[PDB]
Homo-oligomer: A and B are copies of this chain.
Amino acid sequence: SGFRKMAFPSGKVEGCMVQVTCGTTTLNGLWLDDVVYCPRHVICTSEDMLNPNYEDLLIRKSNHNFLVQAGNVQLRVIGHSMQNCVLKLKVDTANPKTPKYKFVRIQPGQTFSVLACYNGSPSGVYQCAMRPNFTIKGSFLNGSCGSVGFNIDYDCVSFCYMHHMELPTGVHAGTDLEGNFYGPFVDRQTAQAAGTDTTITVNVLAWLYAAVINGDRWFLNRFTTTLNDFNLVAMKYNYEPLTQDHVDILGPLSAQTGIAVLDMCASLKELLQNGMNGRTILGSALLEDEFTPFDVVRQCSGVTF
């Protein structure tokens, strides 16, 4: 019993974290095989960030301008190239701790673990969701750039996020490991804002199933709804539309608890229109949306890595 916000075990990723320094700028890099990946803004000074020409700033750097430290060992940079907003530093040593990995681009609503790092040293691990507005509500201080987000699917680490920036509202923006930003963001010190966010409906439903599995049933009711009527309610409350794909994905949880997906939608509709009336669900007074249906099944079944 119990239901916690749980991250994947971070060990496989910890063995890949390195410190990357270029001039006065120091941030984190991800060392996989013979390449160290890091935000391309490591080559910028604060003035360069106002309007950077990354190709022009990079052509002025030699391999020796990049200092890569893995633990207490200095790696030798033997090449440097840019792919979108990520800088790739070829090093003379393949990381002996390189796990089985892949680079995956995730969709809004998908969750991942973040290994927050400073000076190439892991400091903490937390579970995030990619918001519908493409930001993450992370916890990052100055020096955290280059920290990565990941999932584990069997024994393979799927890297899905690299941290680049903090927006004025305190939320975060980054890229996939191919350097493509999530969201309409750019790696420049210019006015940028997170758009209006919405709640991840399929994740709220998954978390309501987790509550039922854990013995919290007060919010259940005799009613059901149509998918179209539920979406009319969900739109009114700044909830993401629930698709038939979402309904299908919730099938196993629906069969396990005996509550059809549209039966759980009727519970959620009532919660949106009436609130919780002083009650909590899994120790929360808000509807949690940072657990996917897969996270709920994984946590409730004890899948290991």
Question: How many subunits of this chain does the assembly comprise?
Answer: 2
Query: In the complex, which of the residues A144, A285, A302, A303 has the most CB atoms of chain B within 10 Å of its own CB atom?
Result: A302
A116 at the interface (CB under 8 A from B): yes
> How near does chain B come to A190, taking the closest CB pair, in angstroms?
19
Contact A9 B214 (CB under 8 A): no
Task: Name the prevailing secondary structure of the A interface residues.
Answer: loop
* One of B2, B115, B117, B124 near A299 (C-beta < 8 A): B124
Contact B8 A305 (CB under 8 A): no
Report A87-115 CB contacts with B as 1/0, cut-off 8 Å: 00000000000000000000000000001
Contact B1 A140 (CB under 8 A): yes
Contact A139 B2 (CB under 8 A): yes
* One of B1, B11, B285 near A122 (C-beta < 8 A): B11
* One of B126, B144, B280 near A286 (C-beta < 8 A): B280
Contact B8 A11 (CB under 8 A): no
The 8 closest A-B pairs by CB, nearest first: A11-B11, A121-B304, A1-B170, A2-B139, A285-B285, A6-B124, A9-B122, A4-B139
Q: A300 CA to B285 CA in the complex, in Å?
A: 24
A10 at the interface (CB under 8 A from B): yes
Contacts of A4 in B (CB 8 A): 124, 126-128, 137-139
Contacts of A121 in B (CB 8 A): 304-305
> How near does chain B come to A221, taking the closest CB pair, in angstroms?
22
Contacts of A6 in B (CB 8 A): 116, 124-126, 139
Contact A9 B124 (CB under 8 A): yes
A171 at the interface (CB under 8 A from B): yes
Contacts of A123 in B (CB 8 A): 9, 298, 302-305
